[PDB]
Amino acid sequence: MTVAYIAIGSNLASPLEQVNAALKALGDIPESHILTVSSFYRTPPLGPQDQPDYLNAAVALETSLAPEELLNHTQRIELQQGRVRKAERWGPRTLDLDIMLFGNEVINTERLTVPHYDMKNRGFMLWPLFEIAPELVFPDGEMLRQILHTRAFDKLNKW
Ligand SMILES: Nc1ncnc2c1ncn2[C@@H]1O[C@H](COP(=O)(O)CP(=O)(O)OP(=O)(O)O)[C@@H](O)[C@H]1O
Ligand SMILES: N#Cc1ccc(CSc2nc3c(=O)[nH]c(N)nc3[nH]2)cc1
Ligand SMILES: [Ca+2]
Ligand SMILES: [Ca+2]
Ligand SMILES: [Ca+2]
Ligand SMILES: [Ca+2]
Ligand SMILES: [Cl-]
Ligand SMILES: [Cl-]
Ligand SMILES: [Cl-]
């Protein structure tokens, strides 16, 4: 078993409903069990700002799936919750499931890059992660607590 950490985001079609539905679906992923769910946070959109606020959260998922097998399921869940691809980069979405970490693994396949390439710069990923895994150490040895102690991130507000 490996513990994967998954970021959840939603800013369309009732984000609270989307995220609660996603938690049920995450539980139904085979060879896998949810260990921990963060609080839900209402976060201002970063990147394009002409969209509704996000609900962001994080979950710890213990799994014996291969990393790309886990991605298969997270993509399936997004699609089954009505995620539609539009032309605009970083457009709003019903559900976004990013694999932040897969144990201590460093993965670089065509479909999957882990750790998530930008997570160390995103409070909306790091704060919910710290809530569920305050002792976390990244594959490069960096400590989550040290990043959050040192780097300026805006305080998150709960949903
Ligand atoms: N760690 C990871 N988690 C989820 N998908 C990943 C991933 N690494 C690579 N991908 C790939 O990322 C592709 C595009 O996903 P998108 O959801 O459109 C990017 P996004 O989440 O909107 O922006 P972001 O990656 O800047 O957070 C997926 O089709 C998947 O193959
Ligand atoms: N700066 C910056 C920046 C940060 C993230 C992104 C990816 S698109 C995106 N996803 C999210 C998300 O889940 N939450 C919030 N609050 N903003 C987002 N923006 C693009 C640019
Ligand atoms: Ca399961
Ligand atoms: Ca826009
Ligand atoms: Ca994302
Ligand atoms: Ca994504
Ligand atoms: Cl809602
Ligand atoms: Cl969508
Ligand atoms: Cl790392």
Q: What are the two backbone dihedrals, phi and then psi, of residue 105, each rounded to the nearest 5 degrees?
A: -75, 145
| Cα–Cα distance, 147 to 128 (Å, whole number) | 14
| Cα–Cα distance, 15 to 54 (Å, whole number) | 7
Give the three-class secondary structure for 106: coil
Q: Residue 99 CB: number of other CB atoms within 10 A?
A: 22
- Do residues 119 and 100 touch, judged by C-beta distance below 8 A? yes
Atom of ligand 2 nearest to the CA of 47: 21
Q: For position 29, which CATH number holds? A: 3.30.70.560
Q: How many domains does the chain have?
A: 1
| Nearest of 91, 79, 103 to residue 6 by alpha carbon | 103
Please name the method used to determine this structure. Answer: X-ray
For helices 15-27 and 67-80, the axis angle rounded to 10 degrees is 140
* Residue bearing tokens 């040192």: 150
| Cα–Cα distance, 155 to 159 (Å, whole number) | 13
Domain holding 17, by residue range, is 1-159
Give the Cα-Cα-Cα angle 159, 143, 153 (nearest 5 degrees): 40
Which two structure tokens, joined as six digits, stand for 104? 């201590």
| Cα–Cα distance, 51 to 93 (Å, whole number) | 10
Q: What is the DSSP letter of 154?
A: P
103 phi-psi bin (left φ>0, alpha ψ -120 to 50, beta other): left
Which two structure tokens, joined as six digits, stand for 91? 């457009």
108 burial level (CB within 10 Å; 0-12, 13-18, 19+): exposed
Q: 139 preceded by cis ω (within 30°)?
A: no
- Do residues 11 and 97 touch, judged by C-beta distance below 8 A? no
Q: What is the DSSP letter of 90?
A: T
| Nearest of 63, 79, 66, 68 to residue 110 by alpha carbon | 68
| Cα–Cα distance, 136 to 155 (Å, whole number) | 19
- Do residues 132 and 40 touch, judged by C-beta distance below 8 A? no
Ligand 2 site-directed mutation target among 11, 83, 90, 154, most atoms within 8 Å of CB: 90
144 phi-psi bin (left φ>0, alpha ψ -120 to 50, beta other): alpha
- Cβ < 6 A, ligand 2 pocket: 9, 43-47, 54, 56, 90, 96, 122, 124
| Cα–Cα distance, 26 to 73 (Å, whole number) | 8
Q: Can you state the percent helix, strand and coil of the chain, rounding each to 5?
A: 30, 25, 45
CA dist list (Å): 87 to 84, 90, 91, 92, 93: 10, 9, 8, 11, 12
